[PDB]
Design a protein around this ligand. Structure first.
Ligand SMILES: *[C@@H]1O[C@H](CO)[C@@H](O)[C@H](O)[C@H]1NC(C)=O
Ligand SMILES: *[C@@H]1O[C@H](CO)[C@@H](O)[C@H](O)[C@H]1NC(C)=O
Ligand SMILES: *[C@@H]1O[C@H](CO)[C@@H](O)[C@H](O)[C@H]1NC(C)=O
Ligand SMILES: [Ca+2]
Lengths: 473, 31
């Protein structure tokens, strides 16, 4: 019966909405914004206008380190801890790391080997330095493998950096950390071979039980310059503290039972009844929904089952708490759950056919999809043809066409009217205005109207057939 | 011997091979 599947789908939707409301808690956005504005918007010192977001050289990084970073990290109340806003407790000690490359890992032409005595390659695993340097006494001057450091790859902006390198664990007090960074700056630590630098720490904020993991990355490309990026991620690792948490756990169990019911219902039908089963487009939606749901359940089980990093940190609290993997898996779980919710909500169209107007529109869309695909092939071919031209012509000067996907995004933004002409115009006096005007005309005057022609024709034909079949039988 | 030395020591990508095989596959798919 249709009523049974309708009511079970509504129950599934209700429990999904409850889960989404629970996971998206009270305003964590304000937590994140306060942390972000404290660490990213304050100028590096009282006389410069540069912050972390606008770093431009290697000396600016040193100004930021022994500067705004220590100002934000250490707040005055025997070796008392530090509360960042008098509320956020700094967990353990922060850590600083760098990834380097090797001298002589490059190829200097023989005719230039007289005014060029050193070439450093771009970052790659097969080219990173592993030898001691400088005052080779501590861990900041000695390579440590990824397994001895409990690290993982990062996928920054320029490349994907490994979890090894040269590291220091800082101190719990402002004075000792300041001395450590001054010593690092004196005996030069960042040189022309440096390729990346990481700063990592975490805070707790016991008021609302929610950890925050902060990572700041600075990339030094081989061609010179500085590229900063940041990441603030809130986590919940002590779930069961209040009654609402138990309610959420019960709802999660209900969700698992619903997923089991849906998969067993799927397999009971796919077995013998209708072996093809794929010419519906609703069965494909059901199978993708259950696949995403089981993937999310697996990720959640794999992630919450082990919190041994937290347990090990609770033994002694003078060490570095390593929470990067937990944040990575939290982000993955969030993405999967958001997509699953979107598709579950889309699945609602299967039941809105209660009169003669809903069925008309659904039939129109179904009969229009085929030739919409047929013309969308041409539309996308022309779109990519414009995108590659923009990439090849403006991709070295404009920063809005620097990468192919960025060209696609800029072309989509042009349709909305969010274009900045002040930089595209002088990138090429000819072929700059030509590209823009032809794109606008052939996108709004031509290709936007063929979709209308097709849709309008199929809708009118559907209505004509439905009105000629009816009132004539 | 030895004659099969292990390839892939780095991560850079060569576009010539990918482009030519893509062309050679698309032409078959249309033919
Ligand atoms: C780098 O290596 C070249 C030769 O490979 C050498 O001449 C140069 O002194 C080296 N520089 C450093 C800083 O090690
Ligand atoms: C390196 O570490 C040792 C450890 O005792 C210390 O004595 C020495 O001063 C350090 N080197 C520098 C340049 O500070
Ligand atoms: C990596 O994890 C192990 C497990 O407790 C720990 O003993 C070790 O100190 C960690 N590595 C570093 C560099 O702290
Ligand atoms: Ca089905």
């Amino acid at each position: 019966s249709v009523l049974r599947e309708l009511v079970t789908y509504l129950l599934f939707l209700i429990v999904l909405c409850i889960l989404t409301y629970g996971m998206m808690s009270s305003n964590v956005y304000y937590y994140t914004r306060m942390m972000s504005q404290l660490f990213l918007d304050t100028p590096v010192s009282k006389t410069e206008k540069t912050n972390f977001k606008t770093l431009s050289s290697m000396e600016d990084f040193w100004k930021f380190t022994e500067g705004s970073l220590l100002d934000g990290l250490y707040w005055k109340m025997a070796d008392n801890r530090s509360f960042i806003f008098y509320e956020n407790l700094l967990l353990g000690v922060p850590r600083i790391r760098q990834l380097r490359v090797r001298n002589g890992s490059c190829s200097i032409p023989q005719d230039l080997r007289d005014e060029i005595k050193e070439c450093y390659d771009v970052y790659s695993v097969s080219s990173e330095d592993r030898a001691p340097f400088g005052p080779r006494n501590g861990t900041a001057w000695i390579y440590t493998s990824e397994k001895d450091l409990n690290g993982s790859s990062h996928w920054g902006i320029i490349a994907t950096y490994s979890g090894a390198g040269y590291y220091l664990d800082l101190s719990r007090t402002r004075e000792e950390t300041a001395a450590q960074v001054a010593s690092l700056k004196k005996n030069v630590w960042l040189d022309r071979g440096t390729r990346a630098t990481f700063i990592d720490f975490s805070v707790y904020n016991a008021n609302i039980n929610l950890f925050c993991v902060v990572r700041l990355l600075v990339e030094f490309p081989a061609t010179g310059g500085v590229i900063p990026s940041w990441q603030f991620q809130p986590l919940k690792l002590i779930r069961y503290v209040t009654t609402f948490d138990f309610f959420l756990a019960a709802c999660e169990i209900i969700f698992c039972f619903f997923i089991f019911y849906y998969v067993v219902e799927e397999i009971l039908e796919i077995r013998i009844h209708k072996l093809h089963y794929f010419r519906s487009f609703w069965n494909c939606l059901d199978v993708v929904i259950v696949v995403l749901s089981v993937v999310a359940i697996g990720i959640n089980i794999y992630r919450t089952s082990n919190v041994e990093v937290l347990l090990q940190f609770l033994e002694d609290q003078n060490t570095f708490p390593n929470f990067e993997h937990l944040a990575y898996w939290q982000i993955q779980f969030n993405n999967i759950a958001a997509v699953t919710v979107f598709f579950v909500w889309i699945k609602l169209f299967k039941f809105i056919n209660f009169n003669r107007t809903m069925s008309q529109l659904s039939t129109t869309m179904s009969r229009c999809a085929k030739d919409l695909f047929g013309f969308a092939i041409m539309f996308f071919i022309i779109f990519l043809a414009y995108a590659q031209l923009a990439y090849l012509v403006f991709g070295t000067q404009v920063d809005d066409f620097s990468t192919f996907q960025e060209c696609i995004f800029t072309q989509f933004r042009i349709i909305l009217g969010d274009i900045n002409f002040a930089e595209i115009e002088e990138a090429n006096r000819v072929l700059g205005p030509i590209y823009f005007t032809t794109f606008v005309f052939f996108m709004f005057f031509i290709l936007l109207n063929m979709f209308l022609a097709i849709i309008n024709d199929t809708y009118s034909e559907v209505k004509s057939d439905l009105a000629q079949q009816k009132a004539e039988m | 011997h030895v004659r099969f030395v292990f390839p892939e020591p780095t991560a850079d990508v060569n576009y010539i091979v990918m482009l030519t095989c893509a062309v050679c596959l698309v032409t078959y798919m249309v033919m």
